[PDB]
Amino acid sequence: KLENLKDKLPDIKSIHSKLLLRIGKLQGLYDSVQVINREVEGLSEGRTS
Amino acid sequence: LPDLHRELINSSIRLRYDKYQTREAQLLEDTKTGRDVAAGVQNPKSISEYYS
């Protein structure tokens, strides 16, 4: 059963490429929340234009 | 009666001699298990890409 190890390899390349996709999405949600917390800090200083 | 007495004792050594042969033979099998069969596969590049 270990002789081929051929058609069992690209179905782990598939589930590993979706996980690296889901990491980069939620790493982008934690970079737009840190934009909202830079505006609400600066706006509640008192200086708007 | 003494005809069959001689063949009976002559066959009980062979039954005990063939028993001792298997105990030495299946203690060699118990060392043969391991990586005797691991270095037999000719597909070594795919079995390191799968584990990585």
UniProtKB/Swiss-Prot annotation, chain A:
<comment type="subunit">
    <text>Component of the THO complex, which is composed of HPR1, MFT1, THO2 and THP2. Together with SUB2, TEX1 and YRA1, THO forms the transcription/export (TREX) complex. THO associates with DNA and RNA in vitro.</text>
</comment>
<comment type="function">
    <text>Component the THO subcomplex of the TREX complex, which operates in coupling transcription elongation to mRNA export. The THO complex is recruited to transcribed genes and moves along the gene with the elongating polymerase during transcription. THO is important for stabilizing nascent RNA in the RNA polymerase II elongation complex by preventing formation of DNA:RNA hybrids behind the elongating polymerase.</text>
</comment>
<protein>
    <recommendedName>
        <fullName>THO complex subunit MFT1</fullName>
    </recommendedName>
</protein>
Curated annotation (Swiss-Prot), chain B:
<comment type="function">
    <text>Component the THO subcomplex of the TREX complex, which operates in coupling transcription elongation to mRNA export. The THO complex is recruited to transcribed genes and moves along the gene with the elongating polymerase during transcription. THO is important for stabilizing nascent RNA in the RNA polymerase II elongation complex by preventing formation of DNA:RNA hybrids behind the elongating polymerase.</text>
</comment>
<protein>
    <recommendedName>
        <fullName>THO complex subunit THP2</fullName>
    </recommendedName>
</protein>
<comment type="subunit">
    <text>Component of the THO complex, which is composed of HPR1, MFT1, THO2 and THP2. Together with SUB2, TEX1 and YRA1, THO forms the transcription/export (TREX) complex. THO associates with DNA and RNA in vitro.</text>
</comment>
